[PDB]
Design a protein around this nucleic acid. Structure first.
Ligand SMILES: [Mg+2]
Ligand SMILES: [Mg+2]
Ligand SMILES: [Mg+2]
Ligand SMILES: [Mg+2]
Ligand SMILES: [Mg+2]
Ligand SMILES: [Mg+2]
Ligand SMILES: [Mg+2]
Ligand SMILES: [Mg+2]
Ligand SMILES: [Mg+2]
Ligand SMILES: [Mg+2]
Ligand SMILES: [Mg+2]
Ligand SMILES: [Mg+2]
Ligand SMILES: [Mg+2]
Ligand SMILES: [Mg+2]
Ligand SMILES: [Mg+2]
Ligand SMILES: [Mg+2]
Ligand SMILES: [Mg+2]
Ligand SMILES: [Mg+2]
Ligand SMILES: [Mg+2]
Ligand SMILES: [Mg+2]
Ligand SMILES: [Mg+2]
Ligand SMILES: [Mg+2]
Ligand SMILES: [Mg+2]
Ligand SMILES: [Mg+2]
Ligand SMILES: [Mg+2]
Ligand SMILES: [Mg+2]
Ligand SMILES: [Mg+2]
Ligand SMILES: [Mg+2]
Ligand SMILES: [Mg+2]
Ligand SMILES: [Mg+2]
Ligand SMILES: [Mg+2]
Ligand SMILES: [Mg+2]
Ligand SMILES: [Mg+2]
Ligand SMILES: [Mg+2]
Ligand SMILES: [Mg+2]
Ligand SMILES: [Mg+2]
Lengths: 155, 131, 233
RNA sequence: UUUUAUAUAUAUAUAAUAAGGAAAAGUAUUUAUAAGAA
RNA sequence: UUAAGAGUUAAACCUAGCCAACGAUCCAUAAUCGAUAAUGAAAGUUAGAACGAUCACGUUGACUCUGAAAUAUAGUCAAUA
RNA sequence: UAAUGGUUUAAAGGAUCCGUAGAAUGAAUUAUAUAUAAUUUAGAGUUAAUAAAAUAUAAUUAAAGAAUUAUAAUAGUAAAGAUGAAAUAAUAAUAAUAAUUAUAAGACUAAUAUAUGUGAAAAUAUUAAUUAAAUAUUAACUGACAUUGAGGGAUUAAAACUAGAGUAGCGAAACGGAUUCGAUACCCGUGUAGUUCUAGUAGUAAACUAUGAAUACAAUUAUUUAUAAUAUAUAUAUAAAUAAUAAAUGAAAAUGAAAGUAUUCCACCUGAAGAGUACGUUAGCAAUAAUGAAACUCAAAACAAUAGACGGUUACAG
RNA sequence: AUAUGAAUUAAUGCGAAGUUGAAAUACAGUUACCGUAGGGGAACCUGCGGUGGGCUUAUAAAUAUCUUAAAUAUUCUUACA
């Protein structure tokens, strides 16, 4: 659940978008996998694949402690109209300052009101929240009435 | 520890230059063996004119009998051998250098190693040495 | 340089100009460029397979795949340092193309250095038009060269007429020797026949070389005598 | 790919073979609001 | 001793502890605060006049009676005028 | 009414590292209520094996060398020494300078040589030895044991001081000779402390990469440098150093794998001058070192770059 | 201790028109500055080490080769092959 690793992944995705690589690899963990899946559902990523440190898996490989160290999640980035679809990826809740919002504050943040110095949600942006070790978008966490930790911004 | 000593013995008797080198080799070898040492090799380098007119004590030397001694011994008696060499009028110059044995137990002298014979087994050649 | 936006979006800028009223008449290229969209993605694409030899890039063999010991006699139980390093650069580098022929060719001109002296033409003619059966070395529309020997070697190995590279290479070499001997005999006999039937030749290769040597040597004579006079003083 | 054949010592090398085609019309409240100048 | 805990005070006997560079102790300054006032987009910042809540004081210090509750704008003693 | 700030050059990275607290941050999987527990190996470590000069770094010990000075001898003669040119109370007829030898003294280490490298920094390249530390890969093992780090601890150039010895060269101060309107300076002579060694004090440098440490990522090229192969050839692959760059960043110069994209921790800065000054406190034998203001004055002050002028600024032509 | 004053006394700030050195900025005419020591009223001078915020401002010891020169390449317009 390392927020440090999520920050590293965010910076990695930004760097990959700058140099316009079509594929990239991130650490294979539950938090990273859920975060990548949430980005993919929103259309920010082209494809998810499971693979080794060298590349995607040619055949399906079961994940065990023997090969966990060498496992990676390969994400395909999107570049449309000469612009990267996934342009900026940032953290709201940082390791030094972690922000856990109740549901009403989360609605206020979505409704243009700055809460705890977090810029309000922007129209084409996505904010991700963690509740009970599950990653979702802010809208779903509000619909689920779940108080949660506000992690990251993807615009 | 394997130590290579290179001594430059003075020649005073023009008729038997090797005598003083013999006495020095006997002394050093006796010391090494009597202090729990081994004398792996004694290579008799020849008579050579010194590069300069080198001076030890008051005598001035222009030529010397060079000789080499490869011996396995301990550090303390090695320093003792060096001390005896330095104060001895017979030894114009002396130098002891370690030959490392970390990888191979047996090693030849610098001269044979430079020629290409890494070990003393190669020096004495290899027949019926697979026993 | 940065990926340039303005070059590929000329249609959008022109459309803005036209709709705003800044430009009154559509350019002649507008409809064409609208019909044919420019490609607006400039992405570095991963490569997973080397076309020349078929080596697969981006594959790691897991610990489970080895249930036996390796050459040193050790079972693979944990990944080693090289296995635990991300290899994205391997995907994004252009793969080096390697061919088996490149080795045999290097052998052939090492074995026959004077075959290099025979001139070669690198102008391709038409590659697609080649219709060759390599059961025999000589091809119409092709010279007889070492590359024919390597091609026959590959044909021999492909059909498994011979098993090892060396055997097929030697067989093709001997066919090459026979054919080149035949050509040499044709040339010698043709020249002899020409002289037999009254043909007169103005210049020969030896005399041509002698003439060129004579010009060079005369210039060298002048320069050496002048230089000796200069150096003497 | 998959499966099988021949050959060779459960395995290896060559050859052949590939199952993924579906169509139908109609069914606003958007939020809080940070200006500089000589 | 108190209606009541506690080195709060008084007595006795033990232990060696307690606070402190995330600032003790000491010094200077200050009545405190609000759904009060001002200001700012806001977080905040300033004031504590006016409205309201709490505390302390009634020229200064200590003690005593009464009392449920007072070291009382009481009494006694002293200090100042 | 600007920190939705900065610290290579404008103010600002601590001289360097080690490490305590941190109410600082921090690996993976599952289960249970924001953690705890159990499992795991990607960080961090331990032990071996292999390869390599682990040669370089630290201490100690033992040696080598070219030269310098002084003294003595030999011969030999009139000058020698220095400077732009000269002259110096102590160069030479008391035979000087120069030459050839022979003695003693200390200090220093030419080529290699690039500080390439090694070291936390300061530093460190004449040789040998004793001990200590430092490399890559593989194998096995621990199982987050990690990062940074207030206070603190250690080391820290040159100068300086305290004791001893040493004192060949160099050389503050001083004494004189020159130059100059003047010389209190540059030049010249004699030269004290110091430079040197041992045992200490102190803890400051333009202690600089004017750039704190760690982690993830980031497009190329060229060289090397170090390994691993495969048969000099694969212009061979994997790493790090160096140089030029792309993007990015920047006030620009420029940085360029960090001055980029991000995360964590620490130190530092808030106009110029007054001022690193005064006073106090702490430590030192002392010089001093650390901590460190305020009033008053002003609309200044500084950085990068631009175009000029100028230079006892270079080169090229005419 | 918290203050209020004080003969005596340490430093620093401003300004009016001037006065004196030639220290810095160019190779600033002895490269500047950093730390330290001494000399000097002061500017500065000198010794020791460090930095470049000065030398990256970097720019030759030179010579070059043989196949049909054409009735053939040069000429060619979607032809012919
Ligand atoms: Mg009690
Ligand atoms: Mg008490
Ligand atoms: Mg008591
Ligand atoms: Mg306090
Ligand atoms: Mg008051
Ligand atoms: Mg009050
Ligand atoms: Mg009031
Ligand atoms: Mg107040
Ligand atoms: Mg009133
Ligand atoms: Mg009262
Ligand atoms: Mg009262
Ligand atoms: Mg009154
Ligand atoms: Mg503000
Ligand atoms: Mg600065
Ligand atoms: Mg630093
Ligand atoms: Mg040297
Ligand atoms: Mg540390
Ligand atoms: Mg030094
Ligand atoms: Mg002394
Ligand atoms: Mg001296
Ligand atoms: Mg001198
Ligand atoms: Mg001057
Ligand atoms: Mg002088
Ligand atoms: Mg000293
Ligand atoms: Mg000390
Ligand atoms: Mg100082
Ligand atoms: Mg300092
Ligand atoms: Mg500094
Ligand atoms: Mg900057
Ligand atoms: Mg001071
Ligand atoms: Mg000047
Ligand atoms: Mg000057
Ligand atoms: Mg003087
Ligand atoms: Mg330095
Ligand atoms: Mg300059
Ligand atoms: Mg410069």
């Amino acid at each position: 659940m390392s927020l440090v690793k999520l920050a590293n992944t965010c910076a990695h995705l930004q760097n990959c978008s700058k140099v316009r690589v079509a594929l990239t690899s991130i650490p294979y963990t539950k938090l990273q996998l859920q975060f990548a899946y949430n980005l993919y559902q929103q259309g920010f990523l082209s494809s998810l694949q499971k693979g080794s440190t060298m590349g995607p898996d040619k055949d399906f490989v079961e994940v065990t402690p023997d090969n966990i160290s060498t496992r990676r999640l390969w994400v395909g980035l999107k570049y449309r109209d000469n612009k990267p679809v996934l342009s900026s990826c940032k953290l709201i809740s940082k390791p030094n300052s972690r922000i856990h919002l109740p549901m009403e504050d989360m609605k206020k943040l979505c409704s243009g009101v700055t809460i705890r110095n977090i810029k309000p949600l922007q129209p084409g942006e996505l904010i991700l929240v963690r509740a009970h070790n599950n990653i979702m978008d802010i809208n779903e966490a509000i619909s689920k009435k779940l108080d949660g930790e506000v992690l990251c911004r993807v615009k | 520890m394997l130590y290579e000593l290179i001594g430059l013995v003075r020649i005073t008797n023009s008729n038997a230059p090797k005598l003083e080198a013999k006495e020095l080799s006997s002394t050093i070898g006796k010391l090494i063996i009597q202090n729990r040492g081994v004398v792996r090799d004694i290579v008799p380098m020849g008579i050579r004119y010194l590069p300069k007119i080198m001076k030890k004590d008051q005598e001035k030397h222009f030529r010397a009998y060079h000789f080499l001694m490869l011996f396995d011994s301990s550090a303390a008696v090695q320093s003792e051998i060096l001390r005896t060499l330095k104060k001895d009028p017979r030894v114009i110059r002396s130098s002891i250098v370690k030959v490392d044995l970390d990888k191979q137990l047996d090693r030849a002298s610098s001269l044979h190693r430079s020629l290409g014979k890494k070990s003393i087994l190669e020096l004495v050649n290899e027949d019926y040495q697979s026993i | 340089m940065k990926i340039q936006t303005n070059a590929v979006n000329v249609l959008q800028r022109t459309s803005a100009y036209l709709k705003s009223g800044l430009l009154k008449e559509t350019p002649a290229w507008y409809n064409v460029v609208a019909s044919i969209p420019p490609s607006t993605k400039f992405t570095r694409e991963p490569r997973f397979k080397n076309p020349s030899n078929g080596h697969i890039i981006g594959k790691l063999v897991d610990v489970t795949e080895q249930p036996h010991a390796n050459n040193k006699g050790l079972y693979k139980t944990r990944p080693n340092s090289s296995d635990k390093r991300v290899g994205v650069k391997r995907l994004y580098r252009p793969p080096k193309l390697t061919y088996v022929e490149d080795r045999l060719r290097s052998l052939f001109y090492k074995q026959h250095p004077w075959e290099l002296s025979r001139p070669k033409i690198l102008v391709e003619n038409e590659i697609g038009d080649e219709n060759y059966d390599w059961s025999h070395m000589l091809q119409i529309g092709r010279p007889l060269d070492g590359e024919s020997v390597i091609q026959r070697t590959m044909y021999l190995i492909k059909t498994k007429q011979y098993g090892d590279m060396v055997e097929a290479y030697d067989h093709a070499r001997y066919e090459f020797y026979a054919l080149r001997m035949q050509e040499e005999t044709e040339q010698q006999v043709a020249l002899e026949e020409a002289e037999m039937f009254g043909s007169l030749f103005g210049v020969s290769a030896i005399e041509h070389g002698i003439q060129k040597e004579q010009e060079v040597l005369d210039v060298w004579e002048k320069k050496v005598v002048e230089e000796t006079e200069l150096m003497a003083a």
